[PDB]
Write a protein that binds this ligand. Sequence first.
Ligand SMILES: [Cl-]
Lengths: 95, 95, 95
Amino acid sequence: MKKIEAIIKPFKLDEVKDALVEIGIGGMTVTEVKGFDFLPKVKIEVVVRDEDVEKVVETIVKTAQTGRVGDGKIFIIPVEDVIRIRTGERGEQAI
Amino acid sequence: MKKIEAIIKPFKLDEVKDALVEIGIGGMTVTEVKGFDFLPKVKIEVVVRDEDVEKVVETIVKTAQTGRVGDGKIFIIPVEDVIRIRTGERGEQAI
Amino acid sequence: MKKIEAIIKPFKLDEVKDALVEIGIGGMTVTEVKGFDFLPKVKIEVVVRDEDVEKVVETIVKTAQTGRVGDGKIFIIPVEDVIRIRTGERGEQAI
Ligand SMILES: [Cl-]
């Protein structure tokens, strides 16, 4: 599994959220952040199976891109395990 | 060492914070976030020794669980090093 | 590449931001957080080449330190890839 941390322009949040739901993303965590003068940005985090990382990255790039400076970045970070708090399920069962 | 990133329901913050302090957690970073309509959630991050990860995960699951949808998730992420800003101590000495 | 996550005292943000720009950091993501009673802190995230991690860590420690309790911590987390949303560039080209 991998954590995908994407920092995007605020006005792109609805579009990116909808696109991710479209490709099957079950849950996401969003945080208001600032970056670059510090400009407001939005962080989106999802944790997905290894085989689904590329489709997610492609979807975010295509939906969040404007071609202008400050579009943001995406980091792929390893995750050794995920646990669903409601049930105690782990791994594939927790995503 | 491992980073433990837990996303929980807001009203569970005091209970989870107290439980973690109870099991010996020395420090934690909390962020107001949103997730799933975006509902308010709270992110808690702690970095602990490998041998202490399971006890922390169990404590968070037991204290943050309600059995209802949206209880959240916990991600275990590898950390290659930790540095204490005040002293420059690293590793076990920085936790 | 590595993600560097630093949690510092709020009043140190301008100084740390300037120092990082001074040593060549191209972009950073800042989040208002709380930690330890929860006191306000600021999280700074940068992703850099492996050979630049130590210089960044040293710069943050030197600029953010006060010698007093609560100065914060720095976590070094592996990053398997970085993607620049504007162009689709990855790796060294995306930093
Ligand atoms: Cl992370």
